Amino acid sequence: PKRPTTLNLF
Amino acid sequence: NNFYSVEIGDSTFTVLKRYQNLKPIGSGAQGIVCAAYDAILERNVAIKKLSRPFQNQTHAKRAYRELVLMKCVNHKNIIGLLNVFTPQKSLEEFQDVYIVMELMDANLCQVIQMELDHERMSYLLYQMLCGIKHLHSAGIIHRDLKPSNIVVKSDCTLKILDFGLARTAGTSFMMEPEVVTRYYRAPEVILGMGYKENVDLWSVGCIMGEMVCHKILFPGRDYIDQWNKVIEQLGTPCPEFMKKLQPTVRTYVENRPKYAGYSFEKLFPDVLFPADSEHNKLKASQARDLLSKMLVIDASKRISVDEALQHPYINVWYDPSEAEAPPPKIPDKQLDEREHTIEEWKELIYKEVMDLE
Numbered sequence: 001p002k003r004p005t006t007l008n009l010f
Numbered sequence: 011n012n013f014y015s016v017e018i019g020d021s022t023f024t025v026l027k028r029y030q031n032l033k034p035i036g037s038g039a040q041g042i043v044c045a046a047y048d049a050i051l052e053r054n055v056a057i058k059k060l061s062r063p064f065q066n067q068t069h070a071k072r073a074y075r076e077l078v079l080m081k082c083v084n085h086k087n088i089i090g091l092l093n094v095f096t097p098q099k100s101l102e103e104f105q106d107v108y109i110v111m112e113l114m115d116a117n118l119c120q121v122i123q124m125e126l127d128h129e130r131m132s133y134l135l136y137q138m139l140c141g142i143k144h145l146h147s148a149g150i151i152h153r154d155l156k157p158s159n160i161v162v163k164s165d166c167t168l169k170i171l172d173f174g175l176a177r178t179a180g181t182s183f184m185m186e187p188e189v190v191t192r193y194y195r196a197p198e199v200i201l202g203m204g205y206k207e208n209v210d211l212w213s214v215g216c217i218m219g220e221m222v223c224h225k226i227l228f229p230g231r232d233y234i235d236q237w238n239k240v241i242e243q244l245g246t247p248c249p250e251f252m253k254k255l256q257p258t259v260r261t262y263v264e265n266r267p268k269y270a271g272y273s274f275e276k277l278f279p280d281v282l283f284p285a286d287s288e289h290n291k292l293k294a295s296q297a298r299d300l301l302s303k304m305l306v307i308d309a310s311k312r313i314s315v316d317e318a319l320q321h322p323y324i325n326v327w328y329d330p331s332e333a334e335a336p337p338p339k340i341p342d343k344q345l346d347e348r349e350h351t352i353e354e355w356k357e358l359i360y361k362e363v364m365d366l367e
């Protein structure tokens with residue numbers, strides 16, 4: 001399992 | 011001089027020209043906080059203006075620890091201190107302290123207004139939990155966690171914020187148990203009992219829940235209705251807990267209606283949780299289980315920080331370096347119960363703010 005790298009903040 | 015000024019509302023910032031083109035982004039309590047571009051740095055930064063650095067014997071104690079702690083505590087999950095200064099020339103003139111920190115895209119409220127998937131929500135929660143831990147490893151409690159004090163970045167990293175109310179152990183039930191933000195006060199705080207490390211863990215619950223439901227968990231029309239919203243939810247705490255309450259509080263608490271409470275399956279029906287996969291650790295079941303171990307009225311029974319970092323929903327991200335990091339070290343200068351004079355303080359704020367840049 002790998003760590004998330006993106007996060008939509010709109 | 012070197013500094014300058016800009017009209018930021020009914021106030022004014024006097025900063026080093028290295029920080030250019032300001033704009034407000036936060037109407038907090040320790041002061042307004044502007045987002046600006048540090049030319050020398052070539053990275054946009056955050057600046058906090060400290061309101062009346064020593065107005066009341068109280069605003070000092072906090073504005074101080076903020077500084078101190080801002081300094082003595084460094085962790086990848088805790089807003090890094092970039093700079094501090096003061097447009098004033100000398101003591102007799104001194105009366106304003108500016109704080110420059112890294113700068114994140116947004117506040118957790120932002121996440122709460124969007125759907126996450128396990129991976130995300132679990133990673134964030136993880137990060138959040140690492141930040142706290144590091145603090146706790148020094149007996150340092152935050153006392154005031156909430157969306158408002160948590161920030162994210164386009165790359166999905168979490169960073170803790172604010173240390174005004176930050177303090178240690180917890181001699182008793184403080185003086186003004188109002189200072190902590192309502193919706194997130196933990197039973198020990200509401201019923202004025204005296205907090206332990208895990209008091210933060212409760213706030214963490216209120217947060218995750220909010221992140222799940224998209225609305226505040228335990229609302230509350232006032233300082234007292236708060237307790238009501240809590241029990242109507244988890245149900246009246248058991249006698250063992252009552253017995254731990256002060257004699258006056260005890261009475262009142264027992265005179266309330268007897269609420270049973272609702273099962274977490276109904277407080278957070280599987281749907282509300284990010285769509286489950288097939289994976290076991292990252293499952294609504296597990297996520298829901300953490301909650302139940304944090305949203306506990308009797309603190310003595312509320313999952314400690316580590317226990318959280320080890321729980322199956324946050325476990326998949328564990329890494330010694332981040333979790334088991336080395337304890338930060340505060341000199342012994344900073345006290346959370348000490349008491350000086352408006353002036354006596356004014357000095358320690360300089361002789362600190364000074365040797366800081």
Ligand SMILES: NC(=O)c1ccccc1Nc1ccnc(Nc2cccc(O)c2)n1
Binds near residue numbers: 058
């Ligand atoms: N006391 C503070 O440090 C404070 C109070 C209120 C609001 C922010 C902040 N601080 C802060 C620090 C770094 N990055 C952001 N990023 C950010 C961006 C957009 C909206 C936000 O709410 C925050 N905000």
